[PDB]
Short mmCIF file of C-alpha atoms in Angstrom, two decimals:
data_model
loop_
_atom_site.label_atom_id
_atom_site.label_comp_id
_atom_site.label_asym_id
_atom_site.label_seq_id
_atom_site.Cartn_x
_atom_site.Cartn_y
_atom_site.Cartn_z
CA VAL A 1 0.00 0.00 0.00
CA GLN A 2 1.26 3.48 -0.92
CA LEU A 3 -0.55 6.82 -0.73
CA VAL A 4 0.75 9.83 -2.68
CA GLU A 5 -0.95 13.23 -2.38
CA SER A 6 -0.48 15.97 -4.98
CA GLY A 7 -1.58 19.58 -5.19
CA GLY A 8 -2.23 22.24 -2.58
CA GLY A 9 -1.45 25.91 -2.34
CA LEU A 10 -2.40 29.29 -0.94
CA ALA A 11 -5.93 30.18 -2.03
CA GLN A 12 -8.39 32.98 -1.41
CA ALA A 13 -11.86 32.64 0.05
CA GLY A 14 -14.18 31.77 -2.82
CA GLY A 15 -11.39 30.25 -4.92
CA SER A 16 -10.63 26.66 -5.87
CA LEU A 17 -7.93 24.02 -5.47
CA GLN A 18 -7.70 20.45 -6.79
CA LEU A 19 -5.92 17.73 -4.80
CA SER A 20 -5.19 14.24 -6.09
CA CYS A 21 -4.47 10.95 -4.34
CA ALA A 22 -2.71 8.06 -6.08
CA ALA A 23 -2.99 4.50 -4.75
CA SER A 24 -0.31 2.64 -6.69
CA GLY A 25 0.74 -0.90 -5.85
CA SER A 26 -1.82 -2.95 -3.96
CA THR A 27 -5.42 -3.64 -5.00
CA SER A 28 -6.71 -0.10 -5.48
CA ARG A 29 -10.24 -1.43 -5.98
CA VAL A 30 -10.99 -3.30 -2.74
CA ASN A 31 -12.16 -0.59 -0.32
CA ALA A 32 -13.01 3.08 -0.10
CA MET A 33 -10.68 6.07 -0.31
CA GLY A 34 -11.08 9.08 1.96
CA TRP A 35 -9.73 12.58 2.36
CA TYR A 36 -8.97 13.82 5.88
CA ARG A 37 -7.64 17.11 7.19
CA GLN A 38 -5.98 18.31 10.37
CA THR A 39 -5.38 21.71 11.95
CA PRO A 40 -2.92 22.63 14.73
CA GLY A 41 -4.01 21.35 18.12
CA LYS A 42 -7.12 19.72 16.66
CA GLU A 43 -7.89 16.13 15.73
CA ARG A 44 -7.77 14.71 12.22
CA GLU A 45 -11.27 14.71 10.71
CA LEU A 46 -12.92 13.10 7.71
CA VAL A 47 -13.65 15.41 4.76
CA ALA A 48 -15.08 13.07 2.11
CA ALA A 49 -14.90 9.45 1.01
CA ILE A 50 -15.72 7.46 -2.13
CA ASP A 51 -16.19 3.74 -2.67
CA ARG A 52 -15.56 1.56 -5.70
CA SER A 53 -19.12 2.06 -6.95
CA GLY A 54 -18.62 5.84 -7.04
CA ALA A 55 -20.85 6.50 -4.03
CA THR A 56 -19.70 9.41 -1.88
CA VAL A 57 -20.06 10.80 1.64
CA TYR A 58 -19.17 14.30 2.83
CA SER A 59 -18.60 16.04 6.13
CA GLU A 60 -21.21 18.73 6.76
CA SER A 61 -18.49 21.41 6.77
CA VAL A 62 -17.81 20.84 3.06
CA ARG A 63 -21.07 19.41 1.68
CA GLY A 64 -22.00 21.36 -1.45
CA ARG A 65 -18.57 23.02 -1.76
CA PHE A 66 -16.18 20.06 -2.04
CA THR A 67 -16.59 17.18 -4.48
CA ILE A 68 -14.73 13.86 -4.36
CA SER A 69 -14.34 11.86 -7.56
CA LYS A 70 -12.30 9.00 -8.96
CA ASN A 71 -10.55 8.28 -12.25
CA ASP A 72 -10.48 4.49 -12.47
CA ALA A 73 -8.22 4.71 -15.53
CA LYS A 74 -5.38 6.70 -13.95
CA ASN A 75 -6.25 5.23 -10.50
CA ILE A 76 -6.62 8.71 -8.98
CA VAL A 77 -9.01 10.15 -6.40
CA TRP A 78 -9.61 13.90 -6.68
CA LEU A 79 -10.69 16.34 -3.98
CA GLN A 80 -12.27 19.31 -5.78
CA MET A 81 -12.09 22.07 -3.17
CA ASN A 82 -14.41 24.81 -4.41
CA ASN A 83 -15.92 27.86 -2.71
CA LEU A 84 -13.02 27.86 -0.26
CA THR A 85 -13.33 29.38 3.21
CA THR A 86 -10.73 30.17 5.86
CA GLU A 87 -12.07 27.12 7.73
CA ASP A 88 -10.52 24.92 5.03
CA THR A 89 -6.94 25.80 6.03
CA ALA A 90 -5.35 22.49 7.03
CA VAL A 91 -3.01 19.71 6.02
CA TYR A 92 -4.98 17.28 3.85
CA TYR A 93 -4.38 13.52 3.89
CA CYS A 94 -5.77 10.64 1.85
CA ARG A 95 -6.30 7.18 3.32
CA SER A 96 -7.84 3.93 2.16
CA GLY A 97 -10.54 2.03 4.02
CA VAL A 98 -8.03 -0.64 5.08
CA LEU A 99 -6.60 1.99 7.48
CA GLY A 100 -2.83 1.66 7.98
CA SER A 101 -0.18 4.24 7.20
CA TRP A 102 -0.76 7.90 6.52
CA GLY A 103 0.92 9.66 3.64
CA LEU A 104 2.78 12.90 4.08
CA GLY A 105 -0.28 14.91 3.06
CA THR A 106 -0.23 18.35 1.48
CA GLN A 107 -0.86 21.81 2.89
CA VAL A 108 -3.67 24.23 2.02
CA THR A 109 -4.01 27.79 3.33
CA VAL A 110 -7.02 30.00 2.59
CA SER A 111 -6.62 33.75 3.00
CA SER A 112 -9.46 36.19 3.61
CA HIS A 113 -9.91 39.27 1.43
#
């Protein structure tokens, strides 16, 4: 199992960022994939998850603004972070349903106007 996150950046409130998660190696079609995020002092929290059928779940903080999707060809899970708010500033991590190791994640900062 190997998780590789790509993307990130400094965004403005109302802007957009696209993160990707690659699950090379093991059976990348056995369980779900999820995006998590963590802020200083706080606990890591689920953002969104997708299963092999394409079904999705979202945290209420991001429902309607973020979209999770999968490219079964390239074996990539995307987090489409739209309508960004300062609340979205965090390190973002992707994880499969078989738990295990965390990747290094990638950092997102959202600045107010």
